[PDB]
């Protein structure tokens, strides 16, 4: 009987979120749209820049880092398309938290920014959307990640 | 030379988009692959003792399978840039390397995807085209080719 | 079918134009268009309808009656077989116990199983009978403004026994 | 809408408050016949069922749902409607087999043939149910759980009777 | 201030409103009909394409070649390097004809007009208006 | 294109689980004999019937007959029936009765109860056939020959199961 | 030989599979492989297109050539449901090819094959017969006089 | 062969060709629309002028010639409305060729013009049409006529 | 007596059969036969309409009279689904008939019959009762203020 | 706590029952009873609103206050199907309440109850839970930057 | 000349054409887009609401506050006494900004324009045009 992130909302999300990938050859979309989200993070909190040394963040267009940008949006994507049938999603995200756990130097307050970037970042890249809906769901994804930190 | 054939590379890139769809059918499209695989190799379930791979309809497992397709989506997404592929793909190597996977199994998981795609897809696709591309990815994760 | 065409197919649809049903010879390759040439409505047959709803108001009757003077078949060309019909209506009001029986002449078409009545009075109300095709004890036929082709009032007729 | 065709040979269209009245308002007087007055459907204790798909709320995944009729009264002076009380019950899927249980009241309309219910008041998760028995027999249905305000269609379940 | 995120959005909205086939021609001819009613002199240079009567064919042909150009432009608008190349080749076609530098600045005003009715209230003017400038200046 | 259970209760199930040897619907309508009914395409069955043509390849109305040759069912992925067949045309062009033929592969859904045949290795035109057994019975069938790409119709033809034995 | 009608609907779908995107990554790689397949059978033609720096396969310029070939080619197709606007735009596209040196009436009939040898590898369902028939009546009319 | 003048095309033709006769009292239409086609022929090839002496072509509005203008379009009309069910059409046109055979001084090259007049003449008198379609069918009608000359 | 409503739909179809064309050949021949039937019963009226060269049955002018009668008459009908615009246009059409001499209130009630005696021979299905009822309330509102 | 979605459709009907009219007789009497119920629990607030002649319950002015409260409140609701235009108009409506003195963060959380206190008595079917949830996220965004 | 009846009609027609929800915003923005194309200077005072680009949000917000005002006005338009009170409070908001008295007279011309297309031929111009004056003069 829990209220937040009700059924009818995520149906709106999946519909709006799918307007981007209606185009074919969308590899370049989410590489680029992913390349911005990590850099725009570094210019707010400079501390996190050290964490991405393993992927060589110093090269923005660099191949070794680009392939990392896919994996984050793609990992986010399966989360959204799985919003329905909740009991699976809990297990899905649980495996991401543990994936961020063994990595050291990841501070809980980071995500709080990463949400605020994305919450105000998203409205530029879509045609229409209800901000109230997205606000509910992304509190679901983000807050449940980091529950291991 | 019946290799990735850089034109044919993007053939499957288009077809895959039509098969791997939106909505909850994807979760169903996953179930097919695994239910197919295990029937070819009964003893392969032992490798999944950690994920509750005993029964395949359990929620904890459903999550597992999406990441697998989710992961494979990244692969087929980019066969255009031979650099970024080798980067992204090389990541998968260290994922599987820490345990014993015979070259017999992911030969069968190859056979599994083909059949499922054919059914799921709109009556038209070229096997020998698909056969090459995913096999290139298989040579990838195995670590040596 | 298409427009004025008629669908003869029992198990293997064959689409034929309307003018060849009871033509006199085999056109449908089934052979199923020649079985039906027996006419269903014989002279002396008397149908009585009850009202369904009525907006074309001459007398807005409770229920009206229909009888056959005589059917007749033009010998040589017989998809259509013309009719003489009375239409009796026994009204009642404040004042009067009025009556009516206007004669008219329609035709029954073996093609689409419809019968027609050409306007009995100058008011231009055609009565459009339609059987289902397998029954012939009742039809759902209803009145139409002959000029405009608009459904105005329905009646459900029955044969009397 | 707001009227119900009669049951007989010749279809008329008569207003919904005039069935099972004790006065014949049709042509043939279809309204007096036990092919209509039969109460077999709202006799106390009957219960409908059939697993529900949820579109609008709770997203629980299809699980059984029953409706049941706890007590029925028909007032001698206004026989047009059968006032009644019910209890809706549907299986939440958590771990153990469990069920939340709304409680209901509403009327059964001989016109539409459709009983319709509503949540009582101060009841957790306030839903209402609309069952149309427009099929031939007095069993089976096409119901729907609705939100009581909008009559917006929350969950649709095609229900039978055991 | 454009070229990144704020550029990407122009692509998606270009796909939708621009339509397809018989719907495309009807779009183009609905554009020019705006500006010629506003600025009557503009039909002087079109005597080559029989711009006497825009509804006539052969102009219909022209105006589609026009919009097709924006496709080439807007399509490659992500990759900055290759962008200038088309902008370079494009200006060359407009060197040999009598123009005013004010007609260009007029054009983008009446183009973003017509997209209004089909998109109603949904789009970023800021994204378009500034990012069509990056197309228009390359022609000067 | 998803399988609809029906009965006391009803809801969607994705076409790829229909007859899989696992319970997928709640009341098991999908693993039943009357829906699975493995053989409506058992080899040797022959279908026949006429075909009008309102599409391309304009010619007189004539008779056709598809005959199923092959059948296969991989007992790991049991959900579809891969099969071969041969397509016959008894049309009279002129000066003789000339008979076209070609071989065709394709498959047969249990969910949608409709088989689909595409011509193989055929440089010549030979337009593909598509059936459906919507009748609920296993003799009759509605088919129409379609272009392989757009899938828009042409040549609506009906067929009957030629008598066994 | 008679573009007919159904053949055009056949095209409109075929062309919609190759062209579908707002990015140019795909539309480039396909058309580049057309000429890359052309030059292997007529190396003499490669002596032309020197203005565009043909010698560089990867140039910051050469793409800006092929891109306009597509958008020109795609411009043809989207007119097939509306004729009489084709002729006008056809005659125009013809004259832009007579103003230069080295047009082999012979080379047009060459590239007609070039697609027929490099299409069936990008798509899956494809009609060779259709695409080959309605494509000549395009090219046979852009090589109307000579060159 | 087998390909040209496919089924789907002539359905377009009959639909477009029927837009003219939607109006009643169309006798005057096709008299006038027929009166132009013969005169506009004489001003290209002057030779044919001699052939129409029997119908008195010298009078444009003349009754004796007007009644001839109907019979040509009307004869063309039944050809178009009969395009479907081909085996009849062959016989239909075959009877026109033989009708032009016994007439002397009718040169095969004339029709080649008469097509070019009509092919570019028609686009003025109709709302919309696909030139490619009409081109296919009129090659069918004209080329098969004159096969006796 | 009460134009009612259904009578108007009855008209709108009847009038659509006679008026259907972009040519004037038919609309002329019908209305000319109205007056040609009128003058047979009121030869006195024929003394009027001298301004239009009535004496020539086929004049290059006289047609240009009857044509404006139709297009005026047809202008009435196409207003019946929208009233209140009728009165205005009715009152106008009235005043154009009082500015001359020789227009008798008796003449209008005559032509009311003129259509009825010879209006149908053109159509097949026709309602005499309807056309006759709604036509008076048109004409009886023209002769109100006129002698 | 998460306005969600369904709750908003729940509102849009509830609000449509109270607001339905072109006359102001009803919209006034309802909102006046809101504050009339408010002041009973916070008489201190009544010391504010002196600018509008509060002390007269039926003034020719005071109505002209409550009327703009409704039309402002109703202006919020008709945006819930379109967000991002809410924030802008939300932030605006916030600042109009910080330019004065005597507006306590405690007062807003009071009127949240005031509707729940007596808004049902006007309607019949009513969802307390819904109206109460989506109303805070309106008001708790007005008192953010205010004391 | 504005009276009990001829006023009443404006209320009923205000209900219909004004619409609801997402349909309301689309109405407002379709209004201003009329006048700014006609009288370009009018966008000078809106630099506070970023009236640079009307399609941008925050102006969308504004223009709805505008129309909402007419509701308050037109809604109470029957009772004459209480009418002036809102008209009194309304003018106060417009005192402190640079206006011309001609822009008002312009406004009602282009407002009754847009209602034309949605109502076609059905309404009393006389009722509106005169009874919007009783709203407009109270602002002077
Ligand atoms: C919001 C949703 C996010 C998702 C779904 C996500 C997902 C992932 C996943 C799956 C990986 C592991 C890649 C692999 O094992 O192949 C990864 C890596 C990483 N993520 Fe995230 N992440 C998210 C947000 C963040 C945020 C906000 C931060 C930091 C502020 C962060 C920092 C990292 C870092 C540092 C790595 C290290 C990768 C490496 O060393 O190669 N992530 N992310
Ligand atoms: C194209 C073929 C394959 C791809 C692309 C693939 C990809 C992946 C990916 C992306 C993960 C995610 C790991 C994570 O999120 O931490 C994973 C995990 C895994 N894969 Fe695969 N895989 C493939 C084939 C196989 C096969 C054939 C097997 C075994 C028969 C296998 C066994 C596993 C196991 C056991 C894990 C989970 C390890 C754990 O839970 O500790 N994979 N795979
Ligand atoms: C805004 C972007 C513009 C683009 C991308 C563009 C593009 C083009 C193109 C591609 C052509 C034809 C080249 C060919 O047929 O081979 C052309 C021709 C022409 N353009 Fe534009 N154009 C633009 C703006 C303008 C404007 C504002 C005018 C104003 C009148 C204009 C006037 C013309 C004229 C008159 C021609 C015809 C040249 C001729 O017939 O020789 N263009 N333009
Ligand atoms: C098959 C269809 C073809 C189409 C639709 C086509 C169309 C075009 C178009 C639109 C341009 C740009 C013209 C401009 O900017 O005004 C172009 C450029 C060019 N095309 Fe083609 N083309 C085709 C095939 C060919 C072939 C086969 C050749 C030579 C063998 C050729 C040679 C050229 C050359 C040399 C240019 C560059 C013009 C220059 O030097 O400035 N094209 N083509
Ligand atoms: C394109 C379709 C045409 C059709 C369907 C057509 C049809 C006819 C027919 C049926 C007649 C004979 C009338 C009768 O039997 O009583 C006729 C007469 C004739 N036609 Fe044509 N015609 C066509 C085109 C032409 C053309 C192109 C020419 C000359 C260039 C031509 C020259 C004649 C002549 C000279 C006669 C002699 C009629 C006389 O003297 O009475 N026709 N046409
Ligand atoms: C029955 C319906 C009739 C209608 C709707 C009608 C309408 C008209 C109209 C519109 C004109 C042209 C006025 C103009 O150009 O401004 C006209 C002309 C005229 N009508 Fe009628 N008319 C009718 C019957 C009659 C009858 C019965 C008479 C006399 C017996 C009559 C006498 C005339 C005359 C004399 C003119 C010529 C005006 C002139 O001298 O220039 N009309 N009518
Ligand atoms: C609950 C939702 C509320 C809304 C939507 C709202 C909205 C408004 C609006 C639009 C105005 C008119 C502003 C103008 O004309 O520019 C106004 C005036 C006012 N509001 Fe509210 N209000 C609310 C609640 C309250 C509360 C609870 C208080 C005090 C406890 C308050 C105190 C005032 C005062 C004092 C004014 C008068 C401003 C003046 O003196 O001119 N409001 N309100
Ligand atoms: C026609 C009736 C009009 C009404 C009912 C009206 C009403 C209002 C209202 C309610 C406000 C905002 C008050 C607030 O937010 O607290 C306002 C602001 C404004 N009005 Fe009007 N107005 C009208 C006409 C005009 C016209 C014709 C203009 C012409 C430019 C104009 C320009 C403005 C401007 C610039 C503001 C902005 C004040 C600011 O942002 O600080 N108004 N009006």
Numbering used by the authors:
A (entry chain G), H (entry chain K): 3 to 151
B (entry chain F): 1 to 145
C (entry chain O): 62 to 222
D (entry chain M): 64 to 225
E (entry chain H), K (entry chain D): 8 to 147
F (entry chain N): 65 to 229
G (entry chain E), I (entry chain I), J (entry chain A): 5 to 151
Task: Please quote the paper that reports this structure.
In some invertebrates, including the earthworm L. terrestris, haemoglobins are large extracellular oligomers with D6 point-group symmetry comprised of 144 haem-containing subunits. Giant haemoglobins are arranged as 12 protomers (1/12th units) assembled around a central scaffold of 36 linker chains. Each protomer contains 12 haem groups and possesses a local threefold symmetry axis which relates three abcd tetramers to each other. The abcd tetramers themselves have a quasi-C2 symmetry axis, whereby the ad and bc dimers each share a further local dyad axis that is not perpendicular to the quasi-C2 axis of the tetramer.
The structure of the giant haemoglobin from Lumbricus terrestris at a global resolution of ∼3.8 Å is presented as an example of the use of the ABC-4D procedure. We demonstrate our approach using the giant haemoglobin from Lumbricus terrestris as a test sample. This molecule, also known as erythrocruorin, has been a favourite test sample in electron microscopy because of its large size (3.6 MDa) and its ease of specimen preparation. In the present study, the data were acquired in movie mode on a Falcon II camera, resulting in a 3.8 Å resolution map (EMD-3434). Our L. terrestris haemoglobin reconstruction (global FSC resolution of ∼3.8 Å) is comparable in resolution to X-ray crystallography maps. In the best parts of our map the resolution is sufficient to distinguish between large side chains. Some acidic residues have apparently lost side-chain density, which is likely to be a consequence of radiation damage. The most stable part of the map is the linker-chain core of the complex; the haem-containing globins on the outer periphery have a lower resolution owing to flexibility/movement. In our sample many more ‘top views’ than ‘side views’ were present, generating better statistics in the preferred orientation. We conclude that our cryo-EM resolution is in line with the size-related resolutions achieved in X-ray crystallography, and is also primarily limited by the size and flexibilities of the complex. The quasi-atomic environment of a haem group has been elucidated by single-particle cryo-EM for the first time.
